[PDB]
Ligand binder design. Sequence first.
Ligand SMILES: [Cl-]
Ligand SMILES: [Zn+2]
Ligand SMILES: [Zn+2]
Ligand SMILES: [Zn+2]
Ligand SMILES: [Zn+2]
Lengths: 134, 134, 128, 134
Amino acid sequence: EPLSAAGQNLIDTATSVINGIPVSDFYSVASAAISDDGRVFSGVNVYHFNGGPCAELVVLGVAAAAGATKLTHIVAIANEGRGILSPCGRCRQVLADLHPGIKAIVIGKEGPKMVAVEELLPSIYAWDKDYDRI
Amino acid sequence: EPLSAAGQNLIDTATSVINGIPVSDFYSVASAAISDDGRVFSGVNVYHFNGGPCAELVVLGVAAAAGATKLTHIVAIANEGRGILSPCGRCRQVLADLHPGIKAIVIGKEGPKMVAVEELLPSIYAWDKDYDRI
Amino acid sequence: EPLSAAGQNLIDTATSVINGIPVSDFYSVASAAISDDGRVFSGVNVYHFNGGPCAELVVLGVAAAAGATKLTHIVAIANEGRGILSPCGRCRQVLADLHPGIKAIVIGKEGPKMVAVEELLPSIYAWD
Amino acid sequence: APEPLSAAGQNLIDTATSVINGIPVSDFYSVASAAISDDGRVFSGVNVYHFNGGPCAELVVLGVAAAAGATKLTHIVAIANEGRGILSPCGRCRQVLADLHPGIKAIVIGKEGPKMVAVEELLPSIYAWDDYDR
Ligand SMILES: [Cl-]
Ligand SMILES: [Zn+2]
Ligand SMILES: [Zn+2]
Ligand SMILES: [Zn+2]
Ligand SMILES: [Zn+2]
């Protein structure tokens, strides 16, 4: 699926966010997501060896705090003009479990594409969220 | 150290945030922190078995996105009208490593107290942040 | 890739592990991996809200402790006869970053198949 | 009060030391851990450094112990590579240990030799993970 105007806006928002702060090894990626009501949420990562969140997960916390229950699209943007970063595996899993069908923006052959997170986890592990077990 | 006026405001802010969203197993705690220039940032947790961030780590990402490099105080508040939660061990580590000397607000004998995160990790492990190693 | 004799031996090992221990509130999956020296390492998950490791990550730590530099295959077997579990997304990332080309054993149409971890992360994010 | 290092404690230091010394110096695998169960078996492992929260050595040990059917761990230590010696558990490890192995004693440095400290004492104003439905 090709990048929409809304997707380009997410790229632009996340780029503005990461470029708005000093270059840091700890806070090096911004993410923005849009809700089904059209609100945009953004954040930056927190790098730490105990599993500090990616930018996408910070965005999930910001959206939750705003009561935006349904997120439809999300992108991650690297610092220093480095562009789109695909979601890492952890981000894919958390997004598939908590926001099924959310589309992540990634680099593609003819231009950026918008890919449902489940397609980013072929042969998926689907957490049964009703239980505190794997 | 007894709770300060700014500390009470962080409690009030986090309380307002968590009680402003539907009760959820997954988005169940809010956090608020203040910067050295008086800016207050908030967020909610994202529970997930792959290590979804606590509310405190969402706040760190929000604060970083705003360019607030120095955070001085932080609190976490439970849902359903329910009050202060001390930081978990992971939050203590991340806070100690990334925001040295930040005070966490916790329950105390005469009222809430504000404790330097390092005092919440006796016999501390200090990450040498210059390296991708423990 | 169809399941190999080595992959079946790995499934036997992981199944033996999870079926050999009691029920717990904190674990539910065993994993086993193969090294390019023919070594096999196993472990069970550690469930915790701060990101306790999956079984596969425990296995990586056991491999590392043994000085085992290259792992070629891995599988995760759930308790209660639930069978093979595909790696979760975090496991895929760690495996791709630390053990490029490792094959995860997953369930496909004709039974278990073995799939390079990179194929389990289309449009991959590579840690620099 | 902290207990002085026991013979079993020293055997864990020796185990972790032999483990970490027996492998190539690496930034990804830089710490070994060893723990002893009530049934007297010793379990060991090395950390897996990764930005998605790859486990510390202690967490690997918990998985090793569980796979072996050893449900009760009483003492644990972490030994760093390059003769760097005892590392105290990080904040995440303290939380996981307290929640999963209450009363386990961590071996940490002391002014008069190493001491063995109940992990709850390493988390003043402790956060306890509480849910019967899940
Ligand atoms: Cl984690
Ligand atoms: Zn990520
Ligand atoms: Zn926490
Ligand atoms: Zn996993
Ligand atoms: Zn640790």
